[PDB]
Design a protein around this ligand. Structure first.
Ligand code: HDD
Ligand code: HDD
Ligand code: HDD
Ligand SMILES: *[C@@H]1O[C@H](CO[C@@H]2O[C@H](CO)[C@@H](O)[C@H](O)[C@H]2NC(C)=O)[C@@H](O)[C@H](O)[C@H]1NC(C)=O
Ligand SMILES: *[C@@H]1O[C@H](CO)[C@@H](O)[C@H](O)[C@H]1NC(C)=O
Ligand SMILES: *[C@@H]1O[C@H](CO)[C@@H](O)[C@H](O)[C@H]1NC(C)=O
Ligand SMILES: *[C@@H]1O[C@H](CO)[C@@H](O)[C@H](O)[C@H]1NC(C)=O
Ligand SMILES: *[C@@H]1O[C@H](CO)[C@@H](O)[C@H](O)[C@H]1NC(C)=O
Ligand SMILES: *[C@@H]1O[C@H](CO)[C@@H](O)[C@H](O)[C@H]1NC(C)=O
Ligand SMILES: *[C@@H]1O[C@H](CO)[C@@H](O)[C@H](O)[C@H]1NC(C)=O
Ligand SMILES: [Ca+2]
Ligand SMILES: [Ca+2]
Ligand SMILES: [Ca+2]
Ligand SMILES: [Ca+2]
Ligand SMILES: [Ca+2]
Ligand SMILES: [O]
Ligand SMILES: [O]
Ligand SMILES: [O]
Lengths: 688, 688, 230
């Protein structure tokens, strides 16, 4: 924090000043008499309002909705026989980082829990330059050439005439594009499985997507896939829960991250690479240059390089998070590109687009973008030039500055260099590689590898989405494409949307799998930051007292208990009015609160004699319990709190429903078991 | 220098890096083979060229052509009984300064020695905020209301169809405006006298132009005019010599200032004020709110407050000089505005225009614009936000930040305050004050006060300019307006331009004067940085030796001797080819060089047998001497060098022509006398 | 519609072109062989991606989330004895309009049905110039001096450290400001009644909020409040 603290403005106990250090007041405009017109000579007014009028900058063209944190990387080894990268040069070597997570399609201010691909962008402030791995939470992307990006994004984003719908693929154009461009199918399945609706940014993995090169000082290369393996564990929602979260808390995932860091529950990921040889580009049966293809870990294991920990929130979101400007072109000696046509064109885009955002060329001079390494070059001027170059002779080769700055390359000065054995051959052409043409086998691989419930979640997502596609031509074209993945998938979706069941096409059908590829099916590794909503009553103080007791039994695993009651009495954390099932990973009815959960509570007429509360909507306590159950959450009840389960027609005989005598260790153990499972999949119907 | 040095980039003996600190090479694009196409993935190429492509920012809308220097202000007193301004609070108190001098009409590459009003903009980086006095070298301005600024400037700047002519008023539109808007006449006379074509930025005075208020801590006011009284002395060219300088050295005045500072010849000005009472606004026969009016020093003397010295050149012109953004709204406690409608509207313009130049709202964060006083306020965000505000609650009144930042006003925190007895009264209206209507008496005052030669210079400027006006209507309208100043002026100008001699119109004629108001008529106070060109010959080594001898006798007064010869031999400073009279304040023919000055030298046929030099154009040495003489400069000759005077028909009997036996003290004394006089006015014809 | 139709681009059954009218294709980058690197000389790629890269403009500093529609105004009278405004000069006189409705605090992707004050901005393209009545669905505003606007808006908008919460007053700073600056209370009650959460933009009224002057050709004035009665 040494570096960024030089730019901090501390406004504790100080007098107000203009931006040029003149002390001022700023609460009344200068007027001609008490009730007079405002004077033009009021510079205090105009400077204040001019700053205000110009606060905004263009949102990012994609990934506009996102959230950042500072952290650190630790290398596990001296990787010099693999890469010349300085940040990987020794066991225990540490490098600062900044990471931003995001959705893709929605604008600023859109819901965190929209269904989408998620950005997972990681900057290493290395001692040999900034290195960015600008990744996502899904290892494959929709399209195979960067020139198609505007097509994909215009189709996914809102209609051009009326700008509907926000942050959603559930409209004709998106599905038109997906069916017209079947390369999209692999990412589409990932996003419509649990990966499109994660519980938090701490409960996803990251991926660089593209094949990159690692290169040693002597020019030897390997091809790699970059991975960020999360140490908390994958966790995802079901769609109806993600929708409800969008309505109750648009900031749900950004808030989770912020709070977890404030609580000292620092999320971690291991940096890994699947290490391959130059000769492996086509040998696996798909092209390593094709960003729609994964390398299954059965074919190439993930070699772990080191660990990222996120551990400090920004001081000012705009200055740090909004203004961070990631680029795949932020590359360092020891890494190089490949001819993946999607990567190739990204390189252009991310340098250009910062001109839009920053409004000029000196965006690398913003504190969050600056390197932690010296800058010496002949670049000059531009709007917003914050440095003062001492060299008046800004050219090479010079004698007037004694030949400095000096050229750095592979042999001197630790320069960047292109892997020296890379070659080009062939006619200059605008063509789609024939090696890129199997759009369906890997989608099928993914589909085969999912637990039954998560197959169902894909079907139900596609049914929801395509039922909102007005065009019969598009609906039919979607089914025809899905059928090339799996006749089962296609048939199951078709039945909701008025499309004839398709005949099988066996061209790409196969039964191979890859392990643990879905969002569902594994227990969490860490329970840190999960929440238990304890539904209590101010009329039974002992019910509220159970919060602290339960908390003592859950603190050692980083789980918080939130006491919910009718009003803010002592030791109450939230009111029923302010609460919703989507706030809580588990919901527990406290002993003595059961009287709030009557089955008639949704519809009883709130006459003056009725006893109906004005402190919350009719039925709210029972709505929270029922929504928690239906969404698949851990549900519990203490003592006579179990009567509330009976009112809700929830049997403790069901999986993920727990009762206990009191809030001690025995019950906490069972709630921990529930939270580790995270979602109880037997509450979802599956096609037969 | 401590403050700006934090932003310096030293590029001595270092490796080249990108703007994010990755070492690089930058001399060959990445290609597909030795003779192949350039690759998109070449991020080194693109970051280098993108910085290049975006180097430029909009030139200033006026005063685009200018030059800056750092310096210091020292107060001569504790001025607290006159003003609360902190930079004036104590005898000896030092404040850093940055000053930019400029022309007005020309774009940023136009000649220094265009005829124009000149800017004189001085920033004080005070301990209670930046204070800018954005002045000119002329005390009166063309127009009386800021709303007229686009009219004046569109008329003076190049025609809208063809963008002709550059940096000049010698065209129909300008004179159309001057004649239609006779408020212009006072400044016009100043600019067409010597003040339009000064010898250097060190040889002018400065003026705030407007009346301002000085205000004490207890709210008492005085009305003031600000003055910068130069300590070198007024010195100006004649038109023909300003033109020639534009052709030979477009950077002449910028170069003069840079060199003088590098030589330790630091130029100085004393800050002064004409101190007046509130009750004086309409007492003197004109309105103190009218910026076309001077206060004669016979009526109110200048009280001297302290001294500015300019003593350091920028390290990077673009970062420092090009990006400095002055504003009259950069005001401090202790100073306030008046209802001068020109000043009033300036306040709006200079805040607004920086948005254009900077391309966003955070222009006060550029190093050169930063204050040297604390900044604490609730302004936020904007493109190019370089700071990181720690307070997340950026509003008043707050409790979440304990009421900080705190309001500062007259009685707490040393806030700015409007002088509290100022009032408004009357109907809201768009009208020209009747007190502003005498456009002619003060131009006549100025005219009356000039030596005859400088009256002739005004006449000769106006004859030159208006002969370039095509419109007969405009020419006649100009003569009508001039004639309301002085029938003599009008008659003398009319005779060059085919307009009938006007009959007197005597309403505003008078015989009053004010002292020393022109550019001509006083000896210089200091000779620092003036140059003697010694015209020598490599064929007579002793002629070249006179350079060092003469230099020894002139060093003590800061005058340099420049030895001119045919080629760069030992002890030669410039070649004849590279030289011109306009480089030198005095021109002296060295003993032994006379052979180069033959009267047949302009037209001799340069055949194989002629001995004509290929080292310079035909007649160059004699041309330099004749131009020097005709321009009014000190001229001399040493020994037989006086033969060259004969060849050029220059008699030593004329004033400002000196012959010496040798390059010793006696001759040096004559050259100093000549330099002090500066221009010999008897070489210019005057009307009868 | 005649006026805006001059700027329409119809892209039915036509060939693709660059922005300078050269016919093009835009589906494959130019590469050095079938599996090669993309070439810098691919101007088609770069013009397409540069337009993409620069599509966005800053959202409005307030009222970022909103919706527009064209329409028409018809005057019911000759109002010349009240105002010289030409769009009001005759019974039956028609003037084109554009209207934008909005919330206030949320960024441009935030939910329509956030609780907030709503904007109700109506432009009259009059025959003597554009006239805008930039109003809201509530007749009173939170603050009494424009200089306070950044205070109000910084307090209502998300916290400076974490940019939470979106499009909401339900956080400490907002209520800190309301309680410190009780001028706010009138609009607060309006917004926390149903007016904060309308069913549609068609089921609200509009208000100019401020008192304005109407002025006749001979300089006579009235003070007025503007209303849009739905
Ligand atoms: C050629 C266009 C193009 C294509 C094909 C991609 N992107 Fe992209 N992306 C951009 C053009 C772009 C951009 C327009 O340049 C953005 C918007 C803001 C920015 O700085 O870059 C960006 C932003 C952006 C961000 C947000 C960074 C942040 O948090 O500020 C992430 C995480 C990604 N992208 C990730 C990817 C992934 C993993 C891709 C495929 C493997 C991908 N993008 C393809
Ligand atoms: C209402 C318009 C207007 C008016 C009436 C004036 N100016 Fe001006 N002036 C500007 C609008 C402006 C400006 C457009 O705002 C500039 C261009 C660049 C800048 O920063 O401000 C400027 C620049 C500018 C500069 C250049 C500062 C620098 O070196 O960067 C000087 C010295 C002056 N002005 C001086 C004056 C004087 C002494 C005026 C009359 C007494 C005057 N200006 C009237
Ligand atoms: C001094 C600051 C200030 C103040 C006190 C107000 N506004 Fe505002 N308003 C702005 C500064 C601003 C703005 C920053 O200038 C905006 C942002 C976008 C724009 O064009 O203007 C704006 C936008 C804006 C819009 C959106 C127009 C559109 O749809 O594009 C409406 C409807 C209003 N305002 C309405 C009002 C009302 C009825 C106000 C009080 C009676 C009010 N504003 C006070
Ligand atoms: C300058 O500022 C002070 C502010 O002082 C506040 O004044 C009000 C009324 O007395 C009181 O409610 C606050 O508690 C005071 N103190 C603070 C720190 O806010 C004004 O009192 C002065 O009158 C202002 N005016 C002048 C002319 O200086
Ligand atoms: C790199 O390889 C060589 C040969 O295998 C070996 O001696 C050395 O230990 C390796 N370096 C590192 C850092 O592991
Ligand atoms: C690298 O640069 C050095 C120093 O400039 C140069 O002399 C050397 O030849 C270069 N080598 C390569 C690999 O190009
Ligand atoms: C699995 O993949 C291998 C790899 O190509 C392939 O040869 C094999 O046929 C597949 N088996 C099944 C069950 O699809
Ligand atoms: C200011 O005025 C008072 C009264 O004239 C006097 O005591 C003092 O000398 C003056 N102070 C300064 C700073 O000159
Ligand atoms: C000229 O100056 C004298 C001072 O003796 C003054 O009385 C008179 O008013 C002035 N006249 C004009 C026209 O400026
Ligand atoms: C306006 O006023 C006058 C007098 O009241 C009257 O002649 C006329 O009817 C009015 N005109 C309109 C436009 O109503
Ligand atoms: Ca291709
Ligand atoms: Ca159970
Ligand atoms: Ca006026
Ligand atoms: Ca000549
Ligand atoms: Ca003489
Ligand atoms: O992206
Ligand atoms: O100016
Ligand atoms: O607004």
């Amino acid at each position: 924090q040494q570096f960024l603290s030089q730019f901090y403005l501390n406004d504790q106990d100080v007098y107000l000043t203009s931006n040029v250090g003149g002390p001022i007041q700023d609460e009344n405009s200068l007027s001609a008499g008490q009730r007079g017109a405002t004077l033009l000579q009021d510079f205090i007014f105009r400077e204040k309002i001019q700053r205000f009028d110009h606060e905004r900058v263009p949102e990012r063209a994609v990934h506009a909705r996102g959230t950042g944190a500072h952290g650190t990387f630790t290398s596990y080894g001296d990787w010099s026989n693999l890469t010349a990268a300085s940040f990987l040069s020794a066991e225990g070597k540490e490098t600062p980082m900044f990471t931003r997570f995001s959705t893709v399609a929605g604008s600023r201010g859109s819901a965190d829990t929209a269904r989408d691909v998620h950005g997972f962008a990681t900057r290493f402030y290395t001692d040999e330059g900034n290195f960015d791995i600008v990744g996502n939470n899904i290892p494959v992307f929709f399209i195979q050439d960067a020139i198609l990006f505007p097509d994909l994004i215009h189709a996914v984003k809102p209609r051009g005439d009326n700008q509907i719908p926000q942050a959603a693929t559930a409209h004709d154009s998106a599905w038109d594009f997906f069916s017209q461009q079947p390369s999209v199918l692999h990412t589409l399945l990932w996003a419509m499985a649990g990966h499109g609706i994660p519980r938090s940014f701490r409960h996803v993995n990251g991926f660089g997507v593209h094949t990159f090169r690692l290169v040693t000082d002597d020019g030897k290369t390997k091809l790699v896939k970059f991975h960020w393996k999360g140490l908390q564990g994958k966790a995802s929602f079901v769609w109806e829960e993600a929708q409800q979260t969008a309505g109750k808390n648009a900031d749900f995932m950004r808030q989770d991250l912020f709070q977890s860091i404030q609580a000292g529950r620092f999320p971690e990921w291991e940096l890994g690479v699947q290490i391959m040889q130059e000769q492996d580009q086509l040998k696996f049966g798909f092209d390593l240059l094709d960003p729609t293809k994964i390398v299954p870990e059965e074919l190439v294991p993930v070699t772990i390089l080191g660990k990222m920990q996120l551990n400090r929130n920004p001081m000012n979101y705009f200055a740090e998070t909004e203004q961070v400007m990631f680029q795949p072109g932020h590359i360092v000696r020891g890494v190089d590109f490949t001819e993946d046509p999607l990567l190739q064109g990204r390189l252009f885009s991310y340098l250009d687009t910062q001109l839009n955002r920053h409004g000029g060329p000196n965006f690398e001079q913003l504190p969050i973008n600056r390197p932690r390494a010296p800058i010496h070059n002949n670049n000059r001027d531009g709007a917003g030039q914050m440095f003062i170059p001492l060299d008046p002779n800004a050219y090479s080769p010079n004698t007037e500055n004694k030949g400095s700055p000096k050229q750095a390359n592979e042999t001197v000065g630790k320069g960047f260099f292109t892997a020296p054995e890379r070659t080009a051959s062939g006619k200059l052409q605008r063509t789609l590689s024939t090696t890129f043409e199997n759009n369906w086998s890997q989608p099928r691989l993914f589909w085969n590898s999912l637990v039954n419930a998560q197959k169902e979640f894909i079907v139900d997502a596609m049914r929801f989405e395509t039922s909102n596609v007005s065009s019969s031509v598009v609906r039919d074209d979607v089914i025809i494409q899905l059928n090339r993945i799996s006749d089962n998938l296609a048939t199951r979706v078709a039945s909701a949307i008025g499309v004839e069941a398709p005949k099988p096409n066996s061209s790409f059908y196969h039964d191979n799998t890859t392990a643990h590829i879905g969002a569902f099916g594994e227990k969490l590794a860490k329970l840190d930051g999960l929440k238990v909503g304890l539904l209590a009553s101010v009329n039974k103080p002992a019910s509220i007292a159970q919060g602290a007791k339960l908390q003592v039994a859950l603190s050692s695993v980083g789980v918080d208990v939130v006491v919910v009651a009718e009003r803010m009495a002592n030791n109450v954390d939230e009111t029923y009015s302010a609460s919703d099932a989507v706030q809580f990973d588990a919901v527990v009815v406290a002993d003595g609160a059961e009287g709030l959960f009557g089955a008639d509570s949704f519809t009883v007429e709130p006459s003056a004699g009725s006893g109906a509360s004005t402190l919350y909507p009719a039925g709210r306590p029972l709505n929270i319990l029922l929504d928690a159950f239906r969404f698949g959450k851990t549900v519990g009840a203490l003592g006579s709190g179990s009567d509330a389960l009976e009112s809700g027609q929830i049997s403790s005989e069901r999986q993920g429903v727990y009762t206990g005598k009191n809030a001690g260790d025995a019950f906490a153990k069972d709630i921990k078991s529930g939270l580790s499972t995270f979602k109880f999949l037997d509450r979802f119907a599956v096609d037969e």
